[PDB]
Symmetry: D3
Subunit: 153 residues, 6 copies
Amino acid sequence: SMSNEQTFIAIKPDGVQRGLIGPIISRFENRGFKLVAMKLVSPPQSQLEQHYADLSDKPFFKGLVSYMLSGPICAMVWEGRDVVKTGRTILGATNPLASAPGTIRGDFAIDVGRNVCHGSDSVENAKKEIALWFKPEELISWKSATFDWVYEK
Amino acid sequence: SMSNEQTFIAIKPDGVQRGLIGPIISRFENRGFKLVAMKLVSPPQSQLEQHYADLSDKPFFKGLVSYMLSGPICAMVWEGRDVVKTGRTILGATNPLASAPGTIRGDFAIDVGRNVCHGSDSVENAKKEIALWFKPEELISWKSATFDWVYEK
Amino acid sequence: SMSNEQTFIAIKPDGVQRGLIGPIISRFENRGFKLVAMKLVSPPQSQLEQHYADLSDKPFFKGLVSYMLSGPICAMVWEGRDVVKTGRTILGATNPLASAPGTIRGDFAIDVGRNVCHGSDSVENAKKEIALWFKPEELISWKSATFDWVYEK
Amino acid sequence: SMSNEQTFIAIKPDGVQRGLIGPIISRFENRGFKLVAMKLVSPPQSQLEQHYADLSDKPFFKGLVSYMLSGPICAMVWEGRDVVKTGRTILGATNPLASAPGTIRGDFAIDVGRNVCHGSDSVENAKKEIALWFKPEELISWKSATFDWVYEK
Amino acid sequence: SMSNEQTFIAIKPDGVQRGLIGPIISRFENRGFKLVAMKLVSPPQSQLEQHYADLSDKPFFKGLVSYMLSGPICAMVWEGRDVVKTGRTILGATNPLASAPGTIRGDFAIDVGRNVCHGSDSVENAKKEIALWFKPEELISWKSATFDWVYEK
Amino acid sequence: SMSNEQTFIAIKPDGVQRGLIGPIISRFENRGFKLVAMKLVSPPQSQLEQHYADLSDKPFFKGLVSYMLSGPICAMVWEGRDVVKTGRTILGATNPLASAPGTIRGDFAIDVGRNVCHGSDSVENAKKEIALWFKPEELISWKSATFDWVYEK
Ligand SMILES: Nc1nc2c(ncn2[C@@H]2O[C@H](COP(=O)(O)OP(=O)(O)O)[C@@H](O)[C@H]2O)c(=O)[nH]1
Ligand SMILES: Nc1nc2c(ncn2[C@@H]2O[C@H](COP(=O)(O)OP(=O)(O)O)[C@@H](O)[C@H]2O)c(=O)[nH]1
Ligand SMILES: Nc1nc2c(ncn2[C@@H]2O[C@H](COP(=O)(O)OP(=O)(O)O)[C@@H](O)[C@H]2O)c(=O)[nH]1
Ligand SMILES: Nc1nc2c(ncn2[C@@H]2O[C@H](COP(=O)(O)OP(=O)(O)O)[C@@H](O)[C@H]2O)c(=O)[nH]1
Ligand SMILES: Nc1nc2c(ncn2[C@@H]2O[C@H](COP(=O)(O)OP(=O)(O)O)[C@@H](O)[C@H]2O)c(=O)[nH]1
Ligand SMILES: Nc1nc2c(ncn2[C@@H]2O[C@H](COP(=O)(O)OP(=O)(O)O)[C@@H](O)[C@H]2O)c(=O)[nH]1
Ligand SMILES: [Mg+2]
Ligand SMILES: [Mg+2]
Ligand SMILES: [Mg+2]
Ligand SMILES: [Mg+2]
Ligand SMILES: [Mg+2]
Ligand SMILES: [Mg+2]
């Protein structure tokens, strides 16, 4: 697995409103992943419907989109080895009722419809989501000073 | 599952003695549950024996009661969707040896006889324990400013 | 002077609403003070007017009483050497604008009308406030296991 | 003082490299201030020289600009009553040797030339800096769910 | 079994380099285990080869020894009931990819070759490792003030 | 001021007993100072009397020595620019009553006779204390991966 894999992590409006931006960023920062893009945005309903396009048939789709419009979103790209899969493990189960304490949802969330955060579920979907949410020049190329202490070659 | 389910959480005398009141409250607070009643108490032996009545035949019962009498207890009622079951998940396994890091017992406790907290194990037992430990006027009715960000309802 | 001095600390409705019960308790717990009474309460209007009786001629009085009625209060008695004066130092300046980072108000508060907490300002006023908010039976007598590590003999 | 005052806070490259993005955001989040703009950027030397234009005569100017180019910057706009002045108090003294523990620089920094963060020093300079670093559509208009618990009218 | 079981925990050079000494110590301290020996050391190559002697035929052996020589190590003996097995549970899976958030590796590490810490995997191996890394005079005999609140009599 | 200045910091027996090893190390670690030596020790009375030789005429001397003998001590050497003076600022005032919240004593201590830590008060006394408490080979030479992000040099 390549250490330059990237995933899209978003803090949903309930996470912003409840003051969880700092703690969520710290979870990824402390694990060793590298922040390569971030912005606070209020995207249009059209972008949100495209982001969740595969769930357009679900009964909760309309409420999910409404909720995702109801406040700011903190959109991020994180980079590191197996960051897509491990990022999902850090976030915890989609339904916080199923999540483990020590994960983001297991520490901070209760309802599946207010589960604080989003993370890409595959490398291919992460590439799709990254291009949907960010312009290429918003990804910052840099090298962490502790890279060789986080990674063995 | 209703968002107004309630559970009885108690910090046992070892949790009070070891300075864990703040941290344990923060676990439930940060998860989004609502504190509706709280008091520091030194309850009489008869109340503790009734709390643990279903264990009256166990060999450890007399020692359990004496330990529960040996210091203050922080008695609490927390309210939220599935707070009984999710509260038990936050507490961790009865025997801390079997508990997961990130739970209260998995972070703070070693011995099953010194496992720093109690949580009701079912909705029906929670109602019974709440009534045993609190007068009805000690349960405070209020609405959290972030209720609609914790719950979809 | 004596290590059995007591002060009245209250978390005001804005501190409860903003999820600061755990963090505020931890400030006093970690410092080495002893919690000897605590309850979540929604006190009557006349109790709050008596609490703030020295302020009844101030223009902000009615609004202060009304806001103090607007949500639950976490009422506490803390015990220890110089706990009245040191408790005020932990709380920080009455106006958070004048408070120092590292204090409760310097970490958590902005407006003097929303300064998250209360602490007695003198030993005599502490005794008055403890007698107003607590029945004597609610003060719990116990000895901390680390008393002789917090205090010299 | 108006509660809609805004200031420019930046995490400098040393703060990003040392993994302080989460903790710094939390300092402002926990105090009650509202995040209304944020982005990770690598601005050109021309923008940085304009940002520090008033220090172009200083002997450390060239080294300061080089250092500000040497890694990513987390640029933010925070909003609240007296946020410019109180933001500076949260950051601590420019020279961390003079800073108090409990501030950002007093907790995390040693050298004036590596002092982790920037904050505007006046309302007028904040307006200048905000327009230098952000496009107007990057400022997100929203209303915190706890606004009325942070502010008294 | 007995509350005087001992294990050897070491913070590897990557944990020291990334500023994780405090957090790792706190994990064991907060759980109730007793620190009975500790030192910062840069041990000789033959001590590390003996530490990992069971792995001398693995292909990664020489690189593991070389990285373990590449910075200081914080070497510790922790004492308590089942501290060997529970210590491994606190550390988390050897490969951080398989570790759970809430453990040391699940909170802080990514690569199996950079997994920030070591813990003995059996009581017999703990005794071997303690005798290899510590002179008996470096194990300090003391009684925790909260022993009887961590352990049942 | 040279970045290779060193100071002697010790966690006194009360800090060890009260579970403050992790937190105190994190204060210095997070500030950017370099740990160059550490050991848990129970030093002989003669060493403690020599450490405090300038207080041999004080009325509290015999009690101070007995308390310093009453449990383990965590002895440390920290290195960095102005670490002697800045270390004292992090520790807070000798008498915790006069200390500021956010310092070690202002967060964790009450009594001057139980003030949880020691720090050298001058560069010359630090060299004397370092030599008293450590053998030269116990001081580990290493270079922090973030050295150039903490210091401008
Ligand atoms: N109300 C409701 N919302 C859901 C449900 N399932 C998913 N969602 C929301 O839709 C988002 C996307 O769903 P999905 O892609 O399947 O899960 P995810 O990849 O873990 O976020 C989730 O994060 C939830 O916020 C559901 O059964 N009910
Ligand atoms: N000494 C001892 N105490 C026990 C044992 N099992 C349970 N306890 C204590 O009894 C309490 C109540 O037991 P139980 O209701 O079955 O578990 P809980 O609902 O998870 O607290 C536990 O929290 C322990 O404090 C045991 O085997 N030995
Ligand atoms: N709106 C407003 N409220 C105030 C003012 N001064 C005090 N208060 C409130 O009144 C409470 C009691 O005032 P005081 O006893 O002087 O301050 P305290 O003992 O430090 O809390 C304070 O904690 C504030 O909540 C003011 O000038 N304006
Ligand atoms: N090397 C060095 N850098 C400095 C000095 N003074 C200021 N700086 C840097 O220049 C930045 C801007 O300086 P200034 O506007 O006066 O202070 P600030 O508004 O508190 O950031 C500071 O944040 C420091 O990073 C100095 O005397 N030496
Ligand atoms: N590069 C690499 N290093 C490994 C591998 N397996 C183990 N290690 C390292 O060797 C150490 C000892 O291995 P082991 O005793 O099996 O794991 P541990 O007891 O859980 O630490 C581990 O902690 C890793 O640092 C591997 O497959 N590849
Ligand atoms: N009981 C008592 N102990 C004291 C007093 N003054 C100092 N001490 C203890 O003596 C230690 C050394 O005193 P000193 O060197 O003057 O202060 P320090 O350098 O800040 O530790 C202090 O840290 C206290 O633990 C006092 O007046 N009474
Ligand atoms: Mg999906
Ligand atoms: Mg039961
Ligand atoms: Mg007052
Ligand atoms: Mg300037
Ligand atoms: Mg092993
Ligand atoms: Mg001295």
